[PDB]
Nucleic acid binder design. Sequence first.
RNA 1: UAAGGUGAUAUGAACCGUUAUAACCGGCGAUUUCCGAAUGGGGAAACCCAGUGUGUUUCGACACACUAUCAUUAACUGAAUCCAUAGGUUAAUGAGGCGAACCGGGGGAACUGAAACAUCUAAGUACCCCGAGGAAAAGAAAUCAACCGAGAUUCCCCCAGUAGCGGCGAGCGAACGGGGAGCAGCCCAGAGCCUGAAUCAGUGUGUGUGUUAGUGGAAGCGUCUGGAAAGGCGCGCGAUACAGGGUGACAGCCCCGUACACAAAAAUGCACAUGCUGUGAGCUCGAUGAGUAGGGCGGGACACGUGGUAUCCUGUCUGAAUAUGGGGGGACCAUCCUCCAAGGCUAAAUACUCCUGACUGACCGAUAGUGAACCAGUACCGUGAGGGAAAGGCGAAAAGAAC
RNA 2: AGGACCGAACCGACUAAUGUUGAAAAAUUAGCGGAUGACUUGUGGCUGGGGGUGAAAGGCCAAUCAAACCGGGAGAUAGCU
RNA 3: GCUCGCCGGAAGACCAAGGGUUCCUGUCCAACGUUAAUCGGGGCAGGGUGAGUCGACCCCUAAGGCGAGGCCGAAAGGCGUAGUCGAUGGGAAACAGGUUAAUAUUCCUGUACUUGGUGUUACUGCGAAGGGGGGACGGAGAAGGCUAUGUUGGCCGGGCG
RNA 4: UACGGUGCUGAAGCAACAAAUGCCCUGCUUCCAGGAAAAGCCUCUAAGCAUCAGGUAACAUCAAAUCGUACCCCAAACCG
Lengths: 63, 46, 102, 93, 77
Amino acid sequence: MKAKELREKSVEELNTELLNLLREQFNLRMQAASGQLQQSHLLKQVRRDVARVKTLLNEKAGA
Amino acid sequence: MKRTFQPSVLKRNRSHGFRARMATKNGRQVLARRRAKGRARLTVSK
Amino acid sequence: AAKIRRDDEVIVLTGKDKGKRGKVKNVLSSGKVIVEGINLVKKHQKPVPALNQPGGIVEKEAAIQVSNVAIFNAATGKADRVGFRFEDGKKVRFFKSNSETI
Amino acid sequence: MIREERLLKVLRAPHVSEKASTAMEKSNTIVLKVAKDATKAEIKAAVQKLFEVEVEVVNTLVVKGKVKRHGQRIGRRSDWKKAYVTLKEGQNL
Amino acid sequence: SRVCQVTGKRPVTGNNRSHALNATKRRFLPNLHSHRFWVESEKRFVTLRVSAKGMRVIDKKGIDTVLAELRARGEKY
RNA sequence: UAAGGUGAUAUGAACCGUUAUAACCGGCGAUUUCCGAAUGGGGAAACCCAGUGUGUUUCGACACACUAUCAUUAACUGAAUCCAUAGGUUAAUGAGGCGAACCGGGGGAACUGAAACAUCUAAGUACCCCGAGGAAAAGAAAUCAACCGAGAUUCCCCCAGUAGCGGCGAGCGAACGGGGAGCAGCCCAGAGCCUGAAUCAGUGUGUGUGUUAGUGGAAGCGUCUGGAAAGGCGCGCGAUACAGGGUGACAGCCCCGUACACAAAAAUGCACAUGCUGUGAGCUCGAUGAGUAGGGCGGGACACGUGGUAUCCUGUCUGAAUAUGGGGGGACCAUCCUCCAAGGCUAAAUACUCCUGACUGACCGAUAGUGAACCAGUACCGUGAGGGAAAGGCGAAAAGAAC
RNA sequence: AGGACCGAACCGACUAAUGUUGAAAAAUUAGCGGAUGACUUGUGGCUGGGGGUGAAAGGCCAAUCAAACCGGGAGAUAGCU
RNA sequence: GCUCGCCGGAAGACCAAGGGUUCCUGUCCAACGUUAAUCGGGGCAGGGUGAGUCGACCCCUAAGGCGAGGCCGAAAGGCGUAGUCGAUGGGAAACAGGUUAAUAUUCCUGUACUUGGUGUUACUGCGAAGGGGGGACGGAGAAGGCUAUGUUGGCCGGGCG
RNA sequence: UACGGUGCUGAAGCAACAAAUGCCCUGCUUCCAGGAAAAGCCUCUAAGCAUCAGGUAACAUCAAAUCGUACCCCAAACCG
């Protein structure tokens, strides 16, 4: 990450969003599986979107 | 009636199957010949 | 490069209609394109209106070689040649028959 | 720590079939998909605080075989794990 | 292996021949045999397999030559 | 690169992108499941389970790594045993396994030819074990040569089917020396003087010359025939360009191209500067190659069958000299001549291929070409090593026969 | 009690018939030979080719044996058809 | 459906393995079935398989294999210690009422029950891989007890010609 | 209630004797050719450690993970 986006909108939600990080994805995964209104673009919202920040934040090593 | 073979699946894996051949010089040489012939099966033990 | 695109008129130089013109309605892969109204052929199948359609079935124009379309000249009623690049303007189609180039 | 919030990696999808639409109609029971480890050590302590409902009991079975699709070569269905979850009201000791 | 542990000297291919026409392979073998030696710099004895005339070399060279044939092949005493 | 895109059979449907992270391509990266040499330990491959340590309680061990074996470089512990050391613990690095052919060491045929057949040949080949390199091997004269001279090695052509050897038979067949390809030399047997000095590597960078996602590139129409033309006819046009891919009849001019024109974020072949650091000069006096040579007994390798058998190698006995000393010069002696063994390393002409890339195809066209053009080492068969198919081509356009 | 006699399970073949392009490269019938024993049987392991195993037949070693099965040498060799 | 007939230690019936959807539903007849075929142990698309307790895993081990260090063998390979695996042997807890087209010692409904962990109060030596005890295992022979079972009686439901 | 299933209700529910291959039983008895071991379990101690862990008593308490489960069955679902 270049300094214009480096550690913005990411470290300040690293622990405080953790109680909704998997629940909000699960909520949408359960809904994107139903076929409601034939919406298939939801599979590009519950995936290809929600790992994109935290996996660029990875630099601590170990646990 | 019958003709010299068992349904025994253990005897079909224990001595000519992958781990049993992979434990032997000449068996590891068969794994190479199956790759040289280009078969989709490395072992027919199953 | 792409010589034809969606906006210029094509003469269709094949022995398919031997007159009629159109434009590209969709651009495809592997050297093919679709041209508006050129091949609206009926298919020998039932329309199944189900009292849910008024109704009928509808023709859709089918893929042809991009090498068969050719641009229309609109000056003598013949085909034209495109060409590429100029000393001014980015990635421009040259139009080998016009003294003006963008 | 004891239990992390990383452990909320449970559940895959809903499922829809007449067995549930008939033989689970007079119970508050639901059908779900789970992945290979079936989360058997953490699912009960997780799903009670993940889906707005309280859980009574959890089970999971494996849907196996059906290797046939075409008259030439093989097209495998491959194994998948199907969960049956019942939601709670009151107590029963 | 009947190969000399202090020199690397090996068996050799060769035939047996007579007045007669039919001849056969023989292959000749090294004469190595056990002897116990003293390792004074380690205050201990060691048992080593040596050939005839081979000790007459070691007894004029010192055992630190043999302990360097051994170490060249990582072998312990 | 591109207004396109969410791959094919694929229809359908929901969405994306065009200045603001489009899809796709090339380069530079990120993360990297389980089993496998498989290696913490196990097992009926994709399963089951330890120890140790660091962080942490939110106080059920949660989180996350390391850990076969030997060798090497070296600690911790340590029995008989006093110090020590076997044994045990650990870390760091190396080896293992797989791979086409050539290659080095070990093991190594038969059939075939000799018109039989036992020596010989086939043949150190086929095949099996092990190891290793870009080649292996060979190497800087214990070389020859012949009293005249050459001056590391190897491969090709000759020498020469001669001289040799040979159940003297079949066969085997040189050397010396000549013509080429190809020509780098160094280190130990210690260590003082002198120094980091061609050369290589590791890590970092730059330039030149190639390779590359790429980019431009001429002209044929009118009309007749026909369902459809490039044919025919009429009048031509481009020619550095009429190679041929083809495309919907005989296309230089339809497109894709050809001749020719263009360019380098960065990666990368090659050659070279250079920063750091490791490696390597210059010079001199000593040391100075021993169970090693030589001689027998048994043999091998030599074209050579052991003969008069030298050379080179040696299982085994014997056994020195040590430089007026040692080796070979075809048994051996004498003289003469020329090298100096008993430590090691190495440039490339050569051998070779699964692969990668180009170049040529008077090679094939479905009982041709590989087992193979039809999702064919796939179906099919066998306990398994192993064996292994049958089966092409409606059209321009599915317009694949509505009503 | 029983290396006794009867006899079903099980094991095994004296005769007659059926079958060998047969249902089957060993199965069938009717009278049967044995049947606590040198018995027989479920299961696994160990032993391999000029070697195994055999109250030991060139028998058995997966239809195969005076050297089986598979591959390589191999396009063996054939004064002959 | 009714009747007739055959088998009845089997031509009845319970269950592992091993095979592989054969169990459920639909439509496909083209191919299949040693005949029609409307049927399916056929073709094809979809449905159905839930465990603290079952049988397995963990623990322990036979025959035997695997085997660091150690050893023999040109080599392939073999031997073997420390250890480590392993069944055809030994070890913790399960039975069966509900039922759907097809599911169940698994869910539903009851009852039974074993092993491992966390922790307080009071008092307080616990404990092995070692030692002991037991586990524990020849083949027949001969009484007794007992129970699902047998066969009538009674009882309830029905029959009375 | 679409009775398209899904419940509600409910009789008798007992005596006689005989009886296994199953249960007492791997019992007992009897002869002989003299007949697996280990672990769980009980218990003794070694180790190590301390108002820890364990043990005895009372009482709360977290888990039971790992594999399989349909269908066939002396059978046109195994083997030929």
